[PDB]
Symmetry: D2
Subunit: 261 residues, 4 copies
């Protein structure tokens, strides 16, 4: 009501607010996921947990998650421009707990589009830019795999021209049991660098209307390669477990404060 | 000396950019049938290719593909086996047999581009986007009545084509221009100072059920007056479906001798 | 000294701090610029000036600025990886004043790399992602222009697959007079969206060791196209003035608060 | 029917992806001379091309180019007239005359890639980065003693080559492998079930002063054992310079009849 200067949910500010790079939440997501469960060094994982987050009930449980998404705002406007509403993503997830409640920590994430990257920082998800590839199921022809026993699906991440992660799943059966780390709240750290010479906050992403397709599960394989530094390398798999292929949706509304310390 | 199906030659032949056919394709298509000026279409038909039984029938075709060679090796590297594509198709005939001519095509990966020229398909490079059906959540459309699917092509940073389909029913009737042989012109520029009309030989052609509904198509400036001549006079039905084929090689229609 | 959780100048946090996407300033920049001075609707320009910034001494003075940069941190480490240390940029600049002192406001900017984009938001420069092309001078052969009378240089910006801006300069003489809008402080608005249900600050970017090559100046041409919305379109040229081609360097240290309101 | 120097054919010929030669090039080069296993190099030489007077001499060449046709039209669209390139060169001879063979090349734009195959230059697609000299500020090197310049190539998301040069002096001596004719193999895959050895004809070859100093070069895995066979045994001098030429067409060295 009072406002004088230019406005907007985000930069760039403009007289009408229409120029802003980001739209206010809620945002809807619909995606396809290729995920591998793995065993991480629990002491290594612990060092990525900020104060307030404790080790998971199974401290060594981790996951590598490839996904391709479509997203839109409440009005659905972005959906008519597929170039604007799609992105690929790779995440690491670590098991943790907040006040006794299972959650996941995402210490590393990459995406291949700028809007999702910046929107990640708004939520505290530490998204960087990368090149991200993922197999898609086919239903006709021979050039791919079906969502059926024996179907194989692969994921790859490169960053700055170097291969960082490769994952594979060969599915053998369908279940109605969502993978644990993809079915708990994510606990992020909101912090942004200080330009004029920071107060981090631990937040949970608030979601609704979480939906999974049937889950196709089988063997998993996962390989980390050099090219992201030793801090990242500490989270490489000790052992690799089951892989999972499924579709996922949710609505993301905003943050809930877990601790402002 | 060094060998290979294609450049670069190498001692074992492994370095070649392209592998020998056959190649398998599995793709997701968003296609719009439209009416083109028949006189404009005729001017894109080389000798031997005559106007369709329906000279004005054309189509704009967006697709996303996975492909592989006979051994399937490319499938394990999604970054190497995937590409997006936009094509124009024109109805024509050769010796009384219905076919389609592709006067323009764009892809977003180099191997499929070069492989296109091998077959005579006139692929250039572009930026190509296409809606994907969803089955969970709210951020997209289902393959079901009322589902909408969009396609866009930009070239050299300029928007060139936008298409949309809103489906209303499923059928087992493949879109006509996507179910006839393609007749290409095999020609490569002379570097040291002879075109052939060929058809792509395919097998194991497979369609999913075809979701069909309204179609919409717009051409924008940015590719020149020759291309603009093929802009729609009227836009017909749209179709969303999956498609597979195996592509084996070429068959000579004419070498003009 | 006390720190427990993972750390870093920016996300992602890590045990050593090495994983952070951004490095602390200062950052050094060395670039090549193709710039066109133009006349903007002063009333339109005014609406992009937040409280505290007044219209420029010449309220209708604006510029369109294409640049290609190399950048590095104090240790110079980024320079050995050209893919990491280079980016292209397009900016709009508007003339304004703070407490009587000439400055420039950048209402819109685009870059083609993720690190520079995020670093822009840290400073309040409203960078989005785009495709940005710019001619470079040649010194041998025929496939280009020399930095000499008659030399022509072009710039183009596309965003989401649509052409947004095209500029051209044909130079006819060399001067030692830096273009006014490229030789004054930039006044940005620091603001980041609030995730847990904003306090903007007006800041100036503090720079040192500003250096210009000889300036090649001549006719300018500039065209805006649709595809960024009516707020942006309000800043299209009424008339187009001189163009300038030159090399530029500076060291960027941090922000100085102009007003926290 | 429709015409054109290259596909796609069109009624006026304007749609063609490629324009007829001559084409002008102006580029900035970062090059490292190195020693290759002569036996490995020999295996990449087709019949008619014999080992160099110095069989082990090779070079790794990074360049950034602007190009245009005779009318200069492409120059006004920087996005259409610019590309980056990485090449391997091997010393060889044809009928006693020194030449260079390019067994591998990569570029980052589609037109130059296709145009390469027209000439017989075995270009593939890659991601190619190269340092640029600066003249103001601190974020780079000057073309002056102690200046360092780096090059990198990735293909399909894997790093393949890194090179570096630290210059110490200026000379008027063009690097040998960048100052001899290139001998290519013109061949295109048969689609309906005959290579030629050709040289690229150039004129108006121009070098800036050559800044020369130490060179460093590393190959990484990621392209196969054939390519790996050309990895350096030893690395020599590096050179940073500007280069221009006009490329007119091909001259037949042999058609093997
Ligand atoms: C980034 C984060 C989304 C939300 N959940 C994900 N796995 N990715 C964004 O908002 O685009
Ligand atoms: C290019 C051509 C393919 C075959 N049919 C198409 N619609 N695209 C290629 O071989 O990759
Ligand atoms: C973004 C901003 C730089 C600083 N000045 C510019 N003109 N661009 C960044 O820090 O990379
Ligand atoms: C590819 C080949 C050019 C000519 N000489 C080079 N080093 N690259 C093209 O024609 O664009």
């Amino acid at each position: 009501p009072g406002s004088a200067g230019p406005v907007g949910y985000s930069l760039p500010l403009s007289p009408t607010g229409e120029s802003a790079m980001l739209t206010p939440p809620p945002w809807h997501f619909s995606g396809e996921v290729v995920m591998v469960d793995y065993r991480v060094d629990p002491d290594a994982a612990r060092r990525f947990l900020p104060p307030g987050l404790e080790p998971g009930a199974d401290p060594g449980a981790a996951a590598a998650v490839f996904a391709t998404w479509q997203w839109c705002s409440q009005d659905g406007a972005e959906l008519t421009d597929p170039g604007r509403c799609q992105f690929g993503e790779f995440l690491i997830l670590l098991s943790c707990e907040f006040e006794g409640r299972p959650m996941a920590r995402c210490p590393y994430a990459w995406v291949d589009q700028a809007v999702p990257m910046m929107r990640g920082w708004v939520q505290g998800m530490p998204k960087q830019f990368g090149v991200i590839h993922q197999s898609r199921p086919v239903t006709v022809g021979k050039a791919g795999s079906r969502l059926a026993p024996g179907g194989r699906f692969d994921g790859a991440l490169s960053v700055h021209g170097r291969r960082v992660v490769e994952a594979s799943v060969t599915v053998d059966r369908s279940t109605d049991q969502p993978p644990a780390l993809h079915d708990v709240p994510l606990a992020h750290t909101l912090v942004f660098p200080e330009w004029v010479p920071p107060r981090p906050r631990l937040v949970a992403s608030e979601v609704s209307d979480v939906e999974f397709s049937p889950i196709w599960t089988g063997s998993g394989d996962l390989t980390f390669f050099d090219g992201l530094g030793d801090d990242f390398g500490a989270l490489a798999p000790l052992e690799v477990g089951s892989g999972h292929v499924f579709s996922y949706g949710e609505t993301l509304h905003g943050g809930r404060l877990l601790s402002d310390y």
